[PDB]
Amino acid sequence: SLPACPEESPLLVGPMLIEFNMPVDLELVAKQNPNVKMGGRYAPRDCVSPHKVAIIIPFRNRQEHLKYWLYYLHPVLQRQQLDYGIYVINQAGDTIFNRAKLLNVGFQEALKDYDYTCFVFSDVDLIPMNDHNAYRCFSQPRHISVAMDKFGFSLPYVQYFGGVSALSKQQFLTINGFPNNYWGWGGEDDDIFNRLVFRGMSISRPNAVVGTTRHIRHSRDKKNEPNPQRFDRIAHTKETMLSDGLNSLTYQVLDVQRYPLYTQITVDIGTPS
Ligand SMILES: CC(=O)N[C@H]1[C@H](O[C@H]2[C@@H](O)[C@@H](CO)O[C@@H](O[C@H]3[C@H](O)[C@@H](O)[C@H](O)O[C@@H]3CO)[C@@H]2O)O[C@H](CO)[C@@H](O)[C@@H]1O
Ligand SMILES: O=c1ccn([C@@H]2O[C@H](COP(=O)(O)OP(=O)(O)O)[C@@H](O)[C@H]2O)c(=O)[nH]1
Numbered sequence: 001s002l003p004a005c006p007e008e009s010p011l012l013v014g015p016m017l018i019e020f021n022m023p024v025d026l027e028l029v030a031k032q033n034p035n036v037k038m039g040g041r042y043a044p045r046d047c048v049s050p051h052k053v054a055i056i057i058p059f060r061n062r063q064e065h066l067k068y069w070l071y072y073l074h075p076v077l078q079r080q081q082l083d084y085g086i087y088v089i090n091q092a093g094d095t096i097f098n099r100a101k102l103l104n105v106g107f108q109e110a111l112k113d114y115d116y117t118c119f120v121f122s123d124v125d126l127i128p129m130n131d132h133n134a135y136r137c138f139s140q141p142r143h144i145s146v147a148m149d150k151f152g153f154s155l156p157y158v159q160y161f162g163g164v165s166a167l168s169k170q171q172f173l174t175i176n177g178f179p180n181n182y183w184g185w186g187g188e189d190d191d192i193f194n195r196l197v198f199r200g201m202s203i204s205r206p207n208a209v210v211g212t213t214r215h216i217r218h219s220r221d222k223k224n225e226p227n228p229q230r231f232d233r234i235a236h237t238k239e240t241m242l243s244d245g246l247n248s249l250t251y252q253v254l255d256v257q258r259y260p261l262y263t264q265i266t267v268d269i270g271t272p273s
């Protein structure tokens, strides 16, 4: 009986003011966002969204950034009329970080919850400044964080595909998901760009005004040093993507916590092999 949501949401108010200098109380955010259900799940009451979106955040030791993320994104995702859930993929242990492997985990685990057909991969410290910037999937892979304050409100290079992005289930599968062996900082986003290009796709983007994005200024994380093998790795994506990714992934889930505003999956993704 519920009709389809309008194709573009009429609830959008456009540009927004974003500030990171006050404290955030998640209990309060939960009260300001009463329609968000346990585990950070929301679909609209009045219409059926065609967008079944799992939002996937790679994570370790960024609780403060995360509270800001939840405070800003949650009202925006409801105005966009999405059928969505938030997944924070928490890396167990204190060995070298692996951003892309955590993303793969999030894809695979979120599918166990619900028939998601769209995946948004979002770093924890990026907040969109304009709710016209749609956090859902298109017929090509979507790069969302296109105009970040830290790159002067434009793309750092035209093939940049870091920060926030959205792939439909079919696009993510078509590239065998993300690489598992980018350990430490950098390059895995370029590798993923390569993968899309090698499977016949191109990058869809909003314009630079709608795509405006703030990055929470923060200092360097321990245990995520620039990976010095990144430049070699990106040069060989075409060959490696064939057998590195979804089809070579294992991990061990240690703990699943359903909090009011998000599901946190704590996972042992191991160390380099
Ligand atoms: C592989 C990698 O590290 N990718 C990250 C990306 O780094 C690239 C980016 O900094 C661009 C321009 O900003 O420069 C790239 O290096 C080039 C240098 O410009 C140049 O001095 C050298 O001669 O050639 C290089 C290749 O043309 C650099 O690799 O930056 C983004 C955002 O910080 C990360 O998301 C990527 O992981
Ligand atoms: O110790 C870490 C390292 C990074 N990340 C996540 O990985 C993303 C990318 O790392 P980073 O912040 O270093 O990129 P930068 O903006 O500094 O270039 C972050 O936004 C977080 O989501 C994290 O949670 N803990």
Ligand SMILES: [Mn+2]
Pocket: 123, 125, 215, 218
């Ligand atoms: Mn950052």
